[PDB]
Design a binder for this molecule. Structure first.
Ligand SMILES: Nc1ncnc2c1ncn2[C@@H]1O[C@H](COP(=O)(O)OP(=O)(O)O)[C@@H](O)[C@H]1O
Ligand SMILES: Nc1ncnc2c1ncn2[C@@H]1O[C@H](COP(=O)(O)OP(=O)(O)O)[C@@H](O)[C@H]1O
Ligand SMILES: Nc1ncnc2c1ncn2[C@@H]1O[C@H](COP(=O)(O)OP(=O)(O)O)[C@@H](O)[C@H]1O
Ligand SMILES: [Mg+2]
Ligand SMILES: [Mg+2]
Ligand SMILES: [Mg+2]
Ligand SMILES: [Mg+2]
Ligand SMILES: [Mg+2]
Lengths: 526, 528, 98, 100, 532, 155
């Protein structure tokens, strides 16, 4: 009988081996997507275990589709997910930065420096990088649509949608602008709920557009209703328009001859009463999240009203925002204010072999749908991901109007500033400070490597240029492998994205540098 | 850790490094030590070990117990190795070495756990061991008189102290006298092969005897052997290395004849060759014939006709002992059997001992050899008696080399501990802690003695420490009186080299164990 | 230096701090490590001491070569620089005789 | 099963090779694909040869509908995306208590 | 002879086995002690990952089979429950006490004598701590609280950011202070709702001057912000009325069925109207709200939050002055909702936190509450931050309740070791050795601290012991009692002036628990393990 | 109380000291003495019914079915198939008594069993077994001297 203190399946690993393994796992996770950064990035094919294919060069999707066992890799993937959710851009940048900082930390860990000293130096460097990034930023007039389009372009030159840049930029800007809302003194954007992206395979990409309204994949319940209404008055509902069982047990007991017919006639009369209550407002369109009975269809049809049933709650909320209506769950309490006027056209048309319902002429709509036409499902999925990145960048700029030079200029300027600041420490912790300062050069190096030009010569020239006084905006032209001034090239990124990337990478390094013991195999004990 | 598609070492390689593996090594050494812990002292206990074949070996010797244990721990094998080394160089103290080494390791384990550099511990052990050896050499008692009576008494006391831990300790005076006499009858080299150890089942221990001569078992008598006389009063022994039987002249020999006369001549030639050898032996005047090679039935009957004694297939070492005792020479040819090469003993006799027949060559006045005939009720009884006598014989030989002794019962080690503590109290303090730990570790043997005897070790140790501090050198543990006593005046004597070698070997083993920091075990190949 | 108990494929105890012996008694499988081991053994055969120096210097050189390859230099440039530096060190060494 | 686990966190989807269990030779050779279902410590699902009623191109929708036909899948529950988490532990609450 | 279906271990074997198990548990967590300590990172063999430094958490996650190791594990859990700090320290102290006591037993000292010596040593150590090593916080101000919080958060993932985290913790604790009957100000920690959400850096963590809810409005038509909120806390669902099991509807005349069905929802309509007619703006319920009542709230332009946790609702009601209402029934048998049942707050909003939304009740009146929103890099870092934050909150609560603190950095252990070594000579003969071994065992904490810093543990602890011996011998050198360890430089330092403090209750409870566990384990000398 | 020891180290690393230490048994201290005394008592009690003129024979069967009806204690113990080591010691004691004398091969076993049976109750009261052995040696010397005293000579 093998009596042990811990269970048999429990395995404990400790020592410098654990730190080396964590840092190597982070390095390898970085190397997964090292080649997917910059305007000359190459896309990757991911075979979903559910059978689908994901074709993208977005860092977050690639790292999400990968299943790993080493928990440091899981930490890095969670870092990617956090960066994607917080700002929507800079996933590959933050992954690469975390890998580089962990490498330069392993440098000192191989010597006799305690990890806590490295942690303190990293935190000091993070404070200094935040300060410098705020210092070298510039303001933006959000009123100028040209500058906003340029920012979105700089955000989408690295994706497959870059070939149609003006179209995508205009789509994203219009969607973000018209989804912007303000009520009760609170300002919101809410790209997730409203600003829906509906993709229909086929057609051409240049046909994609953002509608001044909401489009749903629904058809009229009865063919006799109108499929084209000029200025509809839309009424939205949640409750079904059919006779339904009560909550409590309500068994009847029939002992007379005429009670059965009376019961059925009462059901019909209740349906007619609901339809009359709806009709009293004189609308043109009735939308219900639930079923609409055939008798209800008849009674609405007699009043020349188009009825659509079984609509998702999110779609109904989007329609309410677009046409300025309020969902009412009890028709007898329907008010004039609830009737949705503001939609300028409703039209059901057939696309391909399937009917679609358009409400696409709203005046001042607070919700919209983005119609994507493309070659196939995977192309449209990648286009939707690129559009999501563009909208996230636009909302970040709208929330914070600060911009920072891109294409390696920010990283090099911050590295030079921290290198100059480190000259007056004279402590044991200045070496990790300098190392993590120059670790930011991995972004210009990766841009040059993906471009194809020589890394060492270009990087040395860039460092020499940045050693001058007013050269904070000098970066790398990722398409030609030459040094340019990004106030001339025009590549700019929101300050929020850079700040989030730096913070997340530094704290990833900090989190993974505090670990020196790994135990595994124990049950969940839940 | 990462898969590293092409791994560096062979798959299955096990590695352990750092403080944890050193602590594990110390624990393994402790485990090895506690296997022989209760075998130490006059209140020691034997241990029974059964191998795979089912044969049991009952022993009190620490080296034997450790050898019989199938130790596979790389750090733990060092204790077995130093036990074997102590057995080889000295022959006694095979348990003390293990106890001392393990106690050293245990005492310095706490400092290892605190991250102390092992080189400092190694240096401290080297310094302490050098000082202890010098102190032992200084305070060891020697007599500058070379009195034969005093020397014999010293050897007897040393043998008694060596023997007072085994199952023959009841007859320790008897066996010590026997061993001392046997060793003094060795000539100049004290060869162990010149002392015969014969084990005969049956009879009491006090029935065991030492033959001032040589004795060996009867060896496969042929027909006609019972007709030879079995007692002589001044025989001349003809030690021979000769096959005395009718046989082919040579392996490659071939005889080709073409006449019946030549056939008869060849047959008669063979018979006459054998008879010429036998007559040459007989005419030499010898009465007892011993041959390493077989002696046939024809020769046996020929000797029986002449009232002679013959015994073939005698073991070679038995023949050598007979030569040493009687003073002849082993002859491969019988052509020149002069009086020079003929042995001589006062009395030869064949007697029965416990259901076996033994040939006795007694009365040798110039014998440089002996023969122990041990009696007992079981095979393991004779084996353990032989092991105890071997320990005593080794001790007596070492004492013959130099009669420098120290008191036993832990007195020498308490004195060494006091001296080492006093020395350590006058050094900076990083080495002081380790030297004090060494001095405290030196107290293990008296504590083990008290624990085995069922005493209270703490009170006895306190009394011993006070006695040594206040003046008094040879105060150890008095097992019988439940107290402490002057062990030098109680004749609990011990050769100095025993403790010297014990300390040296224990220190070397401890330093070697402490030095190692990484253990790598390459996978077993061909498990089969 | 600290002794190492190395147990080979035949359960023969090898406690030592000699680099050549440790590397001989280790089942090294990686071919590059095999080349390093052969270089150390050649040093042992030619001179008799310095095997640990050989292996440590080779490891440091390969680490720094990996760093150089990461920063942008090609393999041939690193090799040429290493050869030039080795020649310079061999030239310098006789002047360091005490 | 991977797709269904997200839909129903209550269910405890798991997989196991037939070799380790100790299945018979026939079951191993031509009865391997089977959805064993247990509830209450007793068998509730009696499905073998799932490919016979599912084919080899069945999706999670097909399996979900097929299981819901027999009323074995627990009913879905309304769920929302938490920020990440709220709770840490449950013990003596010691909530706010304004006292004179 | 026994013929017992099981295994038996007796004597030194079982004692050594128990000591080995305790030593293994201690060695598991010995590497996570002190500012130079480093975190561990567990995997729950389903992919789950837990990065932590808390000893109680590590010992709780691990699966343990040996009984003595289990005893140490629930010792860690109890130390966490009763104090909230010093879990690793108490585990290590208990294991070291067991090891040294077993060594004494192996020296043929009877275990009862060792137990008596340990009891005397524990009592005398507690007495000496309470009489010589206590520092009153009355003359320190807020600095003692800040330094205690910083000391608690050292060795945690929030150590470097202590300058900010300590201020946040102290403000949060002082926000929830209340004085009960008999005038003893109690600080109900665990009333500070800790909310985690990955995203911005650590320094962006927010301390809410109010309450934070991890729930959103039930309908998208309701406003997302109300300035002057009149919170109505309810403890019942607002759905269609359904008759109980004892009530059954049987219809004999069809003319009544429509009226029955209409009343089934008109009852809840009337309840909602009664609640809203009092001016309520925010309605929080533990139960659910269906679409009809959600629309009813939507038309009134008021909040409505469903599935609110009971503890959160109780905290909100206590802070805002609202009263929980499990039903609408006055003492007249009617159905009414008085306006006095409404709480108040200066604002109620639904802010966005990393693509997700949560409800903040800002600046409730009639009581001040608090909540902390922790922002990290991922889930694991947020969990470790929450655990460290809870440790700091518990430390601040202990310091503010009992106003005595002791210097940290192993100064207390060294002083206790010196005093007990000097004192053991005046009690008994064998319990003398037991007390000496207790004193020696107490030195494991500074030794582990020094070892974790890769410094010369022997020399540093020797210097600490020399300083404390000089303090205890010379009457006029009594300021040296505060000389602890400075791990950054590896030199002794006056920790009282440096700002390293701990609650006295931590040391006292740790000593008592460790002594009790050592006594409990030391009693065993024979184990019977029955076959299952 | 058996299976030797099992630690697996306090650091969780493997702790292998003796080859096949998991498959080896170990008795320590007084329990071993009690087991040995009980086995020897069983052997002696089996032998004690074949003592004297009214003794009864033992029908011994070997591994080939050969039958040997005998009263000689040494023969019975030699043909007996035993596994306990103390039983083998008893067999060797009978063999030694047979070799030295040829008679009394049964009395020795009964005497040894009685001696160990008394040693059992002596040990239970806390006497070191070495003390018991020394007392037995002293009493044996006294008994041998008395036997020499009361001996009588024959022609
Ligand atoms: N035309 C360009 N020339 C040089 N650098 C560019 C260009 N376009 C974008 N970049 C840089 O590339 C980076 C964006 O890389 P990207 O592939 O979007 O990574 P992520 O998806 O992680 O944001 C930004 O830092 C930006 O400064
Ligand atoms: N009569 C005695 N009184 C006290 N101690 C003794 C006596 N005889 C031997 N010793 C002690 O026994 C120890 C050696 O025990 P023993 O088993 O004979 O050899 P080993 O050293 O191999 O264990 C010596 O240290 C000696 O001091
Ligand atoms: N600034 C400091 N300098 C020196 N020692 C410290 C400092 N801060 C904390 N310590 C010591 O480090 C130890 C850390 O204890 P910790 O492991 O956090 O307790 P727990 O067992 O609750 O995890 C404390 O005992 C304290 O004495
Ligand atoms: Mg990007
Ligand atoms: Mg001896
Ligand atoms: Mg050398
Ligand atoms: Mg703590
Ligand atoms: Mg008889």
């Amino acid at each position: 009988r093998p009596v042990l203190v811990l269970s048999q399946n429990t395995k404990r690993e400790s020592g410098r081996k654990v730190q080396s393994g964590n840092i190597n796992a982070a390095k390898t996770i970085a190397d997964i997507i090292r080649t997917c950064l910059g305007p000359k990035s190459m896309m990757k094919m991911l075979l979903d275990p559910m059978g689908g294919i994901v074709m993208t060069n977005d860092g977050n999707a690639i790292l999400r589709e990968i299943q790993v066992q080493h928990p440091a890799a899981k930490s890095m993937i969670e870092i990617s997910r956090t960066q994607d959710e917080e700002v929507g851009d800079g996933t590959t940048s933050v992954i690469i930065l975390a890998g580089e900082m962990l490498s330069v930390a392993e440098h000192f860990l191989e010597q006799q420096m305690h990890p806590t000293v490295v942690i303190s130096a990293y935190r000091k460097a993070l404070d200094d990088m935040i300060s410098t990034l705020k210092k070298i930023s510039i303001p933006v007039d959000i009123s100028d649509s040209d500058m906003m389009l340029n920012i979105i372009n700089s955000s989408i030159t690295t994706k497959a949608i870059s070939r149609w840049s003006s179209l995508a930029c205009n789509i994203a800007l219009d969607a973000v602008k018209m989804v912007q809302f303000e009520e009760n003194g609170r300002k919101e954007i809410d790209i997730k709920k409203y600003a829906r992206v509906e993709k229909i395979p086929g057609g051409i990409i240049e046909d994609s557009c953002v509608l001044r309204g909401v489009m749903i994949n629904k058809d009229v319940t009865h063919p006799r209703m109108r499929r084209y209404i000029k200025n509809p008055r839309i009424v939205l509902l949640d409750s079904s328009l059919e006779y339904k069982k009560g909550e409590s047990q309500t068994d009847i007991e029939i002992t007379r001859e005429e009670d059965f017919t009376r019961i059925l006639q009462m059901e019909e009369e209740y349906i007619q009463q609901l339809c009359e209550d709806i009709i009293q407002l004189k609308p043109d369109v009735v939308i219900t999240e639930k079923g609409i009975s055939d008798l209800a269809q008849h009674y609405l049809m007699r009043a020349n009203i188009t009825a659509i049933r079984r609509v998702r709650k999110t779609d109904n909320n989007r329609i309410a925002r677009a046409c300025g209506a309020r969902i009412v769950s009890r028709p007898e309490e329907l008010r004039e204010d609830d009737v949705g006027t503001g939609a300028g056209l409703l039209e059901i048309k057939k696309i391909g072999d399937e009917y679609f319902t358009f409400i696409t002429d709203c005046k001042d709509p607070k919700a919209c749908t983005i119609l994507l036409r493309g070659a196939s499902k995977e192309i449209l999925s990648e286009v939707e991901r690129n559009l999501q990145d563009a909208m996230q960048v636009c909302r970040n700029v709208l929330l914070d109007p600060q911009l920072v030079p891109g294409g390696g200029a920010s990283e090099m300027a911050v590295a030079h500033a921290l290198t100059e600041k480190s000259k007056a420490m004279t402590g044991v912790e200045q070496w990790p400070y300098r190392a993590v300062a120059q670790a930011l050069e991995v972004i210009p190096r990766t841009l040059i490597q993906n471009c194809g030009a020589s890394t060492i010569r270009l990087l040395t020239s860039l460092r020499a240029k940045h050693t001058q006084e007013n050269c904070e905006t000098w970066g790398v032209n990722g398409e030609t492998g030459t040094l340019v001034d990004m106030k001339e090239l025009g590549i700019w990124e929101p300050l929020a994205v850079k700040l989030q990337t730096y913070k997340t990478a530094v704290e990833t390094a900090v989190l993974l540098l505090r670990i020196d013991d790994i135990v595994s195999g124990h049950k969940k004990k839940g | 850790m990462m898969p590293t598609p092409v791994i560096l070492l062979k798959e299955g390689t096990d590695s352990s490094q750092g403080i944890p593996q050193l602590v594990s090594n110390i624990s393994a050494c402790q485990v090895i030590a506690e296997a022989v812990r209760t075998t130490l002292g006059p209140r020691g206990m034997d241990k029974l070990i059964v191998d795979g074949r089912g044969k049991a070996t009952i022993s009190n010797d620490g080296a034997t117990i450790l050898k019989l244990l199938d130790v596979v721990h790389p750090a733990a094998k060092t204790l077995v190795d130093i036990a074997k080394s102590q057995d080889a160089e000295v022959g006694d103290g095979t348990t003390s070495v293990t106890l001392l080494a393990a106690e050293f390791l245990k005492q310095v384990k706490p400092y290892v756990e605190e991250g102390l550099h092992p080189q400092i511990i190694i240096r401290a052990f080297r310094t302490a061991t050098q000082l202890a050896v010098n102190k032992i050499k200084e305070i060891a008692v020697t007599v500058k008189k070379a009195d034969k009576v005093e020397q014999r008494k010293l050897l007897e006391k040393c043998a008694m102290t060596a023997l007072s831990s085994k199952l023959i300790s009841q007859q320790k005076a008897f066996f010590a006298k026997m061993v001392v006499d046997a060793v003094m009858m060795l000539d100049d080299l004290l060869q162990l092969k010149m002392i015969g150890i014969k084990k005969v089942q049956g009879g009491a221990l006090e029935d065991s005897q030492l033959v001032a001569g040589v004795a060996f078992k009867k060896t496969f008598s042929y027909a006609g052997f019972e007709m030879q006389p079995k007692k002589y009063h001044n025989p001349k022994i003809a030690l021979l290395n000769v096959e005395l039987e009718l046989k082919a002249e040579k392996d490659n020999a071939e005889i080709r004849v073409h006449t019946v006369e030549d056939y008869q001549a060849i047959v008669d030639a063979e018979w006459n060759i054998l008879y010429d050898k036998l007559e040459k032996i007989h005419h030499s005047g010898a009465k007892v014939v011993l041959s390493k090679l077989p002696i046939g039935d024809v020769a046996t009957q020929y000797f029986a006709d002449r009232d002679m004694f013959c015994a073939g297939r005698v073991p070679e070492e038995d023949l050598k002992r007979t030569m040493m005792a009687c003073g002849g020479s082993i002859q491969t040819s019988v052509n020149a059997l002069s009086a020079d090469v003929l042995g001589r003993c006062q009395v030869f006799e064949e007697t029965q001992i416990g259901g076996e027949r033994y040939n006795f060559f007694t009365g040798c006045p110039k014998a440089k050899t002996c023969t122990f005939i041990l009696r007992g009720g079981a095979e393991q009884f004779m084996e353990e008696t032989e092991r105890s006598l071997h320990d005593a014989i080794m001790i007596v030989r070492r004492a013959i080399k130099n009669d420098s002794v120290v008191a036993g019962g832990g007195a020498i080690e308490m004195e060494l501990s006091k001296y080492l503590r006093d020395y350590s109290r006058t050094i900076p303090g990083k080495q002081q802690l380790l030297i004090g730990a060494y001095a405290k570790a030196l107290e293990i043997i008296p504590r083990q003695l008290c624990d085995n005897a069922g005493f209270d070790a703490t009170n006895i140790l306190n009394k011993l420490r006070a006695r040594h501090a206040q003046g008094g050198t040879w105060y150890g543990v008095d097992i019988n009186n439940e107290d402490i006593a002057d062990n030098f005046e109680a004749f609990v004597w011990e050769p100095a080299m025993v403790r010297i070698n014990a300390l040296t070997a224990a220190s070397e083993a401890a330093c070697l164990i402490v030095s190692v920091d990484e253990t790598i075990k390459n996978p077993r190949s061909t498990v089969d | 230096g600290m002794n190492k108990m190395v147990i080979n494929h035949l359960e023969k105890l090898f406690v030592t701090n000699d680099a050549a012996t440790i590397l001989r008694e280790l089942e090294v499988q990686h071919p590059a490590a095999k080349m390093i081991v052969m270089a150390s053994h050649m040093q042992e055969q030619e001179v008799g001491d310095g095997t640990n120096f050989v292996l440590v210097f080779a490891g440091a050189l390969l680490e720094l070569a990996e760093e150089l390859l990461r920063i942008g230099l090609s393999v041939s440039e690193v090799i040429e620089g290493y050869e030039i530096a080795c020649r310079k060190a061999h030239e310098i060494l006789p002047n360091l005789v005490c | 099963m991977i797709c269904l686990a997200a839909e129903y966190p209550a269910v405890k989807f798991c997989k196991v090779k037939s070799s380790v269990i100790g299945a018979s030779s026939q079951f191993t050779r031509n009865a391997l694909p089977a959805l064993l279902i247990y509830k209450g410590g007793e068998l509730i699902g009696n499905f073998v040869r799932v490919t016979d009623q599912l084919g080899d191109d069945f999706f999670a929708v097909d399996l979900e509908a097929f299981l819901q036909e027999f009323g074995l899948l627990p009913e879905k529950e309304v769920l929302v995306l938490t920020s990440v988490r709220n709770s840490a532990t449950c013990h003596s609450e010691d909530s706010d208590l304004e006292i004179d | 002879p026994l013929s017992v279906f099981g295994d038996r271990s007796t004597g030194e074997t079982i004692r050594s086995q128990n000591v080995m198990a305790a030593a293994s548990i201690a060695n598991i967590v010995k590497s996570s002690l002190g500012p130079v300590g480093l975190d561990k990172m567990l995997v729950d063999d389903i992919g789950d990952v837990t990065i932590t430094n808390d000893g109680a958490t590590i010992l709780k996650l691990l699966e343990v089979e040996h009984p003595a190791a289990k005893v140490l594990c629930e010792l860690a859990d109890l130390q966490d429950k009763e104090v909230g700090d010093g879990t690793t320290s108490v585990v290590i102290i208990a294991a070291e006490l067991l090891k040294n006591a077993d060594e004494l037993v192996k020296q043929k000292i009877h275990p009862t004598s060792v137990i008596s010596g340990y009891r005397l040593a524990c009592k005398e150590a507690v007495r000496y701590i309470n009489e010589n090593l206590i520092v009153n916080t009355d003359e320190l101000g807020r600095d003692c609280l800040i330094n205690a919080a910083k000391t608690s958060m050292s060795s945690k993932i929030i150590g470097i950011n202590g300058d900010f985290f300590a201020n946040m913790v102290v403000d949060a604790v002082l926000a929830i202070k209340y004085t009960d009957i008999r005038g003893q100000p109690r600080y109900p920690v665990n009333s500070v709702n800790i909310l985690k959400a990955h995203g911005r850096s650590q320094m962006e963590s927010m301390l809410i001057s109010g309450y934070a809810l991890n729930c959103v409005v039930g309908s998208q038509g309701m406003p997302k912000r109300i300035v002057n909120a009149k919170i109505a806390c309810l403890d019942f669902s607002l759905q269609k009325t359904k008759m109980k099991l004892g009530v059954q509807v049987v219809i004999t005349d069809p003319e009544k069925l429509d009226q029955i069905r209409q009343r089934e929802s008109d009852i809840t309509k009337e309840r909602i109207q009664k609640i809203l007619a009092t001016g309520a703006n925010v309605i929080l319920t533990t139960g659910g709200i269906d679409d009809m009542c959600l629309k009813y709230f939507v038309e009134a332009g008021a909040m409505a939050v469903r599935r609110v946790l009971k503890r959160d609702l109780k905290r909100i009601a206590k802070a805002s002055g609202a009263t929980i209402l499990s039903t609408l029934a006055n003492l007249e048998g009617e159905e009414t909702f008085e306006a006095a049942m409404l709480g108040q707050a200066e604002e109620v909003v639904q802010e966005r936190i990393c693509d997700d939304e949560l409800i903040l009740i800002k600046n409730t009146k009639a009581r001040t509450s608090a909540s902390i929103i922790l922002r990290g890099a991922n889930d694991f870092m947020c969990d470790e931050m929450e655990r460290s934050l809870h440790d700091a909150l518990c430390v601040v609560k202990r310091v503010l309740e009992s106003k005595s603190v002791v210097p940290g950095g192993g100064a207390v252990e060294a002083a206790l070791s010196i005093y007990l070594e000097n004192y053991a000579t005046s009690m008994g003969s064998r319990e003398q050795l037991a007390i000496a071994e207790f004193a020696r065992s107490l030195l494991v904490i500074p030794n582990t601290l020094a070892v974790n810093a890769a410094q010369d543990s022997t020399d540093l602890v020797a210097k600490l012991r020399a300083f404390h011996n000089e303090a205890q011998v010379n009457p006029e050198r009594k300021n040296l009692k505060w000389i602890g360890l400075d791990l950054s430089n590896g030199k002794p330092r006056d920790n009282k002036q440096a700002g390293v403090f701990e609650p006295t209750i931590v040391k006292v409870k740790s000593l008592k628990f460790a002594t009790e566990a050592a006594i409990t384990i030391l009693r065993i000398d024979d184990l019977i393990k029955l076959h299952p | 109380a058996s299976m030797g020891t099992l630690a697996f180290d306090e650091y969780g690393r493997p702790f292998l000291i003796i080859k096949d230490q998991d498959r080896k048994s170990r008795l320590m201290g007084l329990e071993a003495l009690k087991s040995h005394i009980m086995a020897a008592k069983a052997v002696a009690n089996t032998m004690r019914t074949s003592l004297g003129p009214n003794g009864l024979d033992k029908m011994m069967v070997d591994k080939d079915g050969d039958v040997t009806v005998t009263n000689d204690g040494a023969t019975i113990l030699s043909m007996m198939d035993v596994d306990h080591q103390i039983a083998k010691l008893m067999v060797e004691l009978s063999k030694s008594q047979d070799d030295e004398i040829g008679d009394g091969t049964t009395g020795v076993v009964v005497l040894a069993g009685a001696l160990l049976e008394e040693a059992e109750q002596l040990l239970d009261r806390g006497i070191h077994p070495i003390r018991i052995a020394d007392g037995y040696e002293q009493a044996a010397r006294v008994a041998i001297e008395h036997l020499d005293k009361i001996s009588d000579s024959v022609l």
